[PDB]
Amino acid sequence: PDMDTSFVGLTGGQIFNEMMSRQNVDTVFGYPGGAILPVYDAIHNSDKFNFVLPKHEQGAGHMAEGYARASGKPGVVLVTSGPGATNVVTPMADAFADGIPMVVFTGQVPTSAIGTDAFQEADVVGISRSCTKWNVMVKSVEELPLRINEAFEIATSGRPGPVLVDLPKDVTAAILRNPIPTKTTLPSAQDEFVMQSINKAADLINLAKKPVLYVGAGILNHADGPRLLKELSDRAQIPVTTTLQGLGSFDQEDPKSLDMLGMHGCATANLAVQNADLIIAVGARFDDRVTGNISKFAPEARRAAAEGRGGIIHFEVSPKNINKVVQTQIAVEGDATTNLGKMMSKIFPVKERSEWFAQINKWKKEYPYAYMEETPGSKIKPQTVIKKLSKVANDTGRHVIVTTGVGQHQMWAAQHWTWRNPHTFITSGGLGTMGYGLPAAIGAQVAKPESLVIDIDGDASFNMTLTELSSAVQAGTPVKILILNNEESHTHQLNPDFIKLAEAMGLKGLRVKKQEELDAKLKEFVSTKGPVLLEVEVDKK
Amino acid sequence: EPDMDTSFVGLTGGQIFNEMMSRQNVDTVFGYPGGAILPVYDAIHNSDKFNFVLPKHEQGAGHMAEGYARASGKPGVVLVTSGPGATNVVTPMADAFADGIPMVVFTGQVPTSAIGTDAFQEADVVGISRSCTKWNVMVKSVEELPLRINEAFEIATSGRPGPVLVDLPKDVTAAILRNPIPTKTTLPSNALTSRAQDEFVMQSINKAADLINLAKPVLYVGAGILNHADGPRLLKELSDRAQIPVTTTLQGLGSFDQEDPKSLDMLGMHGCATANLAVQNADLIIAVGARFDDRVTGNISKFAPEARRAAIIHFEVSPKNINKVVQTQIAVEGDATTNLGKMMSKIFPVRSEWFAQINKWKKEYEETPGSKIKPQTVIKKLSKVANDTGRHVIVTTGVGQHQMWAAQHWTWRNPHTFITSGGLGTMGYGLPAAIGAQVAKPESLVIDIDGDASFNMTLTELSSAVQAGTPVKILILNNEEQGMVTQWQSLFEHRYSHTHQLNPDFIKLAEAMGLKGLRVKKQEELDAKLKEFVSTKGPVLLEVEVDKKV
Ligand SMILES: Cc1cc2nc3c(=O)[nH]c(=O)nc-3n(C[C@H](O)[C@H](O)[C@H](O)COP(=O)(O)OP(=O)(O)OC[C@H]3O[C@@H](n4cnc5c(N)ncnc54)[C@H](O)[C@@H]3O)c2cc1C
Ligand SMILES: Cc1cc2nc3c(=O)[nH]c(=O)nc-3n(C[C@H](O)[C@H](O)[C@H](O)COP(=O)(O)OP(=O)(O)OC[C@H]3O[C@@H](n4cnc5c(N)ncnc54)[C@H](O)[C@@H]3O)c2cc1C
Ligand SMILES: Cc1ncc(C[n+]2csc(CCOP(=O)(O)OP(=O)(O)O)c2C)c(N)n1
Ligand SMILES: Cc1ncc(C[n+]2csc(CCOP(=O)(O)OP(=O)(O)O)c2C)c(N)n1
Ligand SMILES: O=P([O-])(O)O
Numbered sequence A: 001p002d003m004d005t006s007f008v009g010l011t012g013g014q015i016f017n018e019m020m021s022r023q024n025v026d027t028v029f030g031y032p033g034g035a036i037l038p039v040y041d042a043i044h045n046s047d048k049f050n051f052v053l054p055k056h057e058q059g060a061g062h063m064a065e066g067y068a069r070a071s072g073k074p075g076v077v078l079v080t081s082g083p084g085a086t087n088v089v090t091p092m093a094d095a096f097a098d099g100i101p102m103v104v105f106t107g108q109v110p111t112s113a114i115g116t117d118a119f120q121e122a123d124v125v126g127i128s129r130s131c132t133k134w135n136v137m138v139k140s141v142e143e144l145p146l147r148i149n150e151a152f153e154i155a156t157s158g159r160p161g162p163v164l165v166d167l168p169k170d171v172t173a174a175i176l177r178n179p180i181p182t183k184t185t186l187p188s189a190q191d192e193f194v195m196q197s198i199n200k201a202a203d204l205i206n207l208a209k210k211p212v213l214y215v216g217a218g219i220l221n222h223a224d225g226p227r228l229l230k231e232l233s234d235r236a237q238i239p240v241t242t243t244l245q246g247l248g249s250f251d252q253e254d255p256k257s258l259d260m261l262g263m264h265g266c267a268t269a270n271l272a273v274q275n276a277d278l279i280i281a282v283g284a285r286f287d288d289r290v291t292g293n294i295s296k297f298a299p300e301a302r303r304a305a306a307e308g309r310g311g312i313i314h315f316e317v318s319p320k321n322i323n324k325v326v327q328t329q330i331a332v333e334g335d336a337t338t339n340l341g342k343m344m345s346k347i348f349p350v351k352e353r354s355e356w357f358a359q360i361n362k363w364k365k366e367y368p369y370a371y372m373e374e375t376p377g378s379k380i381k382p383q384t385v386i387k388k389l390s391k392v393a394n395d396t397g398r399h400v401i402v403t404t405g406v407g408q409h410q411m412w413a414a415q416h417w418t419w420r421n422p423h424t425f426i427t428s429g430g431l432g433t434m435g436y437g438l439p440a441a442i443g444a445q446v447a448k449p450e451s452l453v454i455d456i457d458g459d460a461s462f463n464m465t466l467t468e469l470s471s472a473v474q475a476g477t478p479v480k481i482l483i484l485n486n487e488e489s490h491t492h493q494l495n496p497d498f499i500k501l502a503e504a505m506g507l508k509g510l511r512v513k514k515q516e517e518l519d520a521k522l523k524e525f526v527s528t529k530g531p532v533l534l535e536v537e538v539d540k541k
Numbered sequence B: 001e002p003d004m005d006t007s008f009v010g011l012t013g014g015q016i017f018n019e020m021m022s023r024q025n026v027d028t029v030f031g032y033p034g035g036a037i038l039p040v041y042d043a044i045h046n047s048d049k050f051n052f053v054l055p056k057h058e059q060g061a062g063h064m065a066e067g068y069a070r071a072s073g074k075p076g077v078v079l080v081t082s083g084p085g086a087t088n089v090v091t092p093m094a095d096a097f098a099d100g101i102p103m104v105v106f107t108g109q110v111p112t113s114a115i116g117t118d119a120f121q122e123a124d125v126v127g128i129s130r131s132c133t134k135w136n137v138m139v140k141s142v143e144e145l146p147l148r149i150n151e152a153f154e155i156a157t158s159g160r161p162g163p164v165l166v167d168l169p170k171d172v173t174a175a176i177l178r179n180p181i182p183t184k185t186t187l188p189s190n191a192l193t194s195r196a197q198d199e200f201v202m203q204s205i206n207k208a209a210d211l212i213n214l215a216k217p218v219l220y221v222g223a224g225i226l227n228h229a230d231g232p233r234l235l236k237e238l239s240d241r242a243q244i245p246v247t248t249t250l251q252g253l254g255s256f257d258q259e260d261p262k263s264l265d266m267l268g269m270h271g272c273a274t275a276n277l278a279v280q281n282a283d284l285i286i287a288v289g290a291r292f293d294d295r296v297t298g299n300i301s302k303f304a305p306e307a308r309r310a311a312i313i314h315f316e317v318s319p320k321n322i323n324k325v326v327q328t329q330i331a332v333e334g335d336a337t338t339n340l341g342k343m344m345s346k347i348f349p350v351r352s353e354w355f356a357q358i359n360k361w362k363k364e365y366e367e368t369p370g371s372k373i374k375p376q377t378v379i380k381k382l383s384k385v386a387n388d389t390g391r392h393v394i395v396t397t398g399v400g401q402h403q404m405w406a407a408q409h410w411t412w413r414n415p416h417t418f419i420t421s422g423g424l425g426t427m428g429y430g431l432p433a434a435i436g437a438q439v440a441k442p443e444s445l446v447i448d449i450d451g452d453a454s455f456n457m458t459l460t461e462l463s464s465a466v467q468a469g470t471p472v473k474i475l476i477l478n479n480e481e482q483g484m485v486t487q488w489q490s491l492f493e494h495r496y497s498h499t500h501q502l503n504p505d506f507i508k509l510a511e512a513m514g515l516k517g518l519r520v521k522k523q524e525e526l527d528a529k530l531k532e533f534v535s536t537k538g539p540v541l542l543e544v545e546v547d548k549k550v
């Protein structure tokens, strides 16, 4: 057996510290507590890590999600036992539904006390079983490195997701006395069937006359995904449409872009999909919000399949989701980016699809998706605020990241903003957690310090977690908080004075009541150095 | 006909739910809207038969419900939507579970036909809340709705009270009851025994009643005694008769008037030193509605010397707790209060060497003008000011040093007046619990003695207080200068700590939320601000800059 002694003499806390470094972790979100003290002190006292403190553990969890989605790295959360652990359940469930990599470490009462109704003792492993890909309770310090490495491996492989590691106080406070297996300290057949599927899929794409790329979140789980997607779209001249969670993976300013697909997407995108002979699904799960009545989804693709000249190709990483909603002609199992890479050289270069694009461009100017404009001297419409802010943001030339709350403003943000860069739309889709906006924006800002981070929030959503406003100031994250306030069966909620709230929290507050002041405020909003909140009184829902 | 009930035929799940709440004597519901719970939400929200309290975050709803229950004696009813709505009430359920607080949580769920398909906002709530509820279930059909509701309330309020969860699929609550259902399933499972039951209990009651009289004793009373209306009343009678010293756990505070000369006050490590000794200088420890927390007896082995010989009576309700931590001599299973009445007769009226011994031990155990303000002084002065109003006063707190100071330096007199998170110790509990308590006792003066870090956890509920019209008095003992994490300290006792959270301007926050804000920086302004604080009509927040070296 290959043994290692480099950790002998250290405490669980220092080992934890060392393991984070080996995992390339430089940011940790969390809140202190007695049970997690040994680890907290180690991380909090090291200048090797940036410890971000929220005002509520839920904040830590959502901040970690924002961090992960904007960086591509797993979000690390550190909290204490009992209430500390239960306060991160929503964020774990949220991350679980959206497939976001997150590693949650929770302090626990001493192993000797487990199952005695000790103070702040909770069956966290049991509580988080359904909202984590995997969880475990470290039983001894020798086991610590192993569990950490497993946690990171699982959280970042297959469909990314959250994992939880329960850390008993006696275990993290103990000192490693014995050497441990070297393997456990270092990070991390059908191979033929998959290669066959890649060939078959290449054959279908080369064969297609009116193909469509239906792209989702999966393409963002690899740094080169968006690049290879563009390459494939250019090489075979294939129009590209994305899901809500796929926004940003393809430049919407590109001529081949169909924009968002679904009951809330562009008519043109929905048409291309209903008329296509081949649909190439890349990192998307065919949600009914996208497909509509499944039995009537992609009729021309079905016909092609029936006649042996098309159908549906699905690049999926999870075997469980293959053929789950729709029967597919071909399924390429595994990482979408990797497989698109292996398939590129097999794709026949297509000079043009004049007819297909003619029909598409015809629908574009035939169904110009536009909301109901605003009548002079009247309540400001939210879609307008978004279309405009998008322009103002764009004029700065900076990299822009957008987070949102949950509600009507969420869909408007998705629809009326012009997406161009990957990892720039961070919204809660799977679970739809109100209050996500602010903390996710803070975490995204910590991940991309130079980026302009905007949170397009709703008034009710914003109230859920507005206490994190002071956390933004403390963390030095200059997030731009936009609140589309449409508050005048019918649950009228009382809102605080958002501007006075902001000032009370330590930020600059701005308000807009009339159309004649919107443009100036939007510019000041985006131009302000430091965190700032802008409330725009908008027309009732 | 008592066989089938037809009164609900034709109604929707939502109206049935509405009717069931009435049969359960529910007039208050805390919750937040969402698509999955819409059918029920609309029914409750549109009825003037119920007061629907809206928080800004579901966690607020849960803690508000706990405060409501502890101050009223009734179960706290919570109504939330699926997914995030359900997961946001997990902490409050875990909190209520640890402190044995009756709470009925109703969560909207995706249609039964969609269960297990990863539908939008679908969560295995029954699985998530299994370890933090006494019982839970997912209603499968509208005919089953009345049954589950009655079971939920029965379980939440019997044995050791606790939280229960009822998962409500949208299609089920939106459906209309077409067929009749058995009357048994629609009648509340409210609350007779046999000679076999009466004898078994009476047996242990007498055996215990003997070991009592035949001894010279101490009452170790806890939260259990407050779970019966006439609980504390019989506690006094049993202390008067045989002249017995009464000591309470943190959760027992208020069960016995600390004015009476027989009060040993609070027990445990952060308790009055006198009590800890009296618990040793006692020949017989009469445990009443307590669970011997290790925080009450660290040296489990060195616990109760004089009582460890001539035979530790235990009036417990859950057999699963008897002889599961400490070792008892006699066990009087069942409701404490009830078993006390069933033992009042067998008690021989009356001790002088007992008091003298204590009074001495007790008689054996401030700030200078110009220096920092001490928390203890704030609490003692506030207790006095509160008392001078003559009103019924209820106190809630956050979690931390201020929690223990509130317990120690306040003078407890009335039952159901100290509402603090002891079992789970949930920071952020103060404000929402105070709002719920206020809704339960509209005429009571409700004070939340909070800490700055704890208060930040849930300060968004401030606007909820204004909206609900609850005139809660929020006291924030801000000691932000000392960190909330100790690195090291002094033996003989300074504290060096780290991790300081940046607090917002509490006064400007209050004003922004719609309340009156007050601040105290110097000792020379404390008394006036305390009086204004308590005298202000409407919700008000008072921040007192306190010494970080206390
Ligand atoms: C009222 C309402 C309206 C909505 N309208 C729309 C709409 O019009 N259009 C729209 O798009 N959405 C809409 N949504 C959102 C929608 O419900 C789904 O949440 C979302 O579209 C799912 O997107 P996704 O498939 O890209 O991501 P996910 O649900 O995260 O699924 C990603 C898929 O990719 C797979 N995957 C992950 N990583 C990899 C990898 N490395 N390699 C290969 N595969 C991988 C996953 O296993 C999974 O199958 C709406 C929601 C609501 C509440
Ligand atoms: C920093 C800190 C310091 C603390 N210091 C102290 C301290 O010094 N002293 C202290 O006491 N606590 C202290 N606590 C609180 C402590 O952790 C426990 O939560 C508390 O002592 C439990 O009190 P209890 O047993 O009275 O109530 P519970 O924990 O609620 O237990 C009640 C018991 O009574 C039973 N019961 C319930 N209803 C009935 C009924 N109707 N009839 C009969 N039996 C019934 C229950 O089943 C249970 O066994 C502290 C907490 C913190 C965070
Ligand atoms: C934690 C949580 N509670 C409840 C819901 C149900 N819900 C979905 S959208 C919505 C209202 C959103 O209001 P607001 O944030 O103001 O946005 P708007 O739709 O007005 O833009 C609610 C209550 C939810 N998604 N999450
Ligand atoms: C939700 C939650 N997170 C963390 C803890 C750990 N914790 C216990 S006391 C405390 C600090 C309390 O600070 P404050 O509220 O300001 O009170 P003080 O002790 O200063 O009076 C913390 C962080 C907890 N009990 N609950
Ligand atoms: O300080 P805690 O984590 O023991 O409450």
Ligand SMILES: O=P([O-])(O)O
Binding pocket: A432, B034, B035, B036, B081, B121
């Ligand atoms: O309104 P929701 O709960 O369906 O998002």
Ligand SMILES: O=P([O-])(O)O
Binding pocket: B483, B498, B499, B500
């Ligand atoms: O309080 P500190 O340790 O974060 O500076």
Ligand SMILES: [K+]
Binding pocket: A252, A259, A414, A415, A416, A417, A418, A419
């Ligand atoms: K767009």
Ligand SMILES: [K+]
Binding pocket: B258, B265, B407, B408, B409, B410, B411, B412
């Ligand atoms: K006292």
Ligand SMILES: [Mg+2]
Binding pocket: A407, A458, A459, A460, A484, A485, A486, A487
């Ligand atoms: Mg709104």
Ligand SMILES: [Mg+2]
Binding pocket: B400, B451, B452, B453, B477, B478, B479, B480
């Ligand atoms: Mg404090």
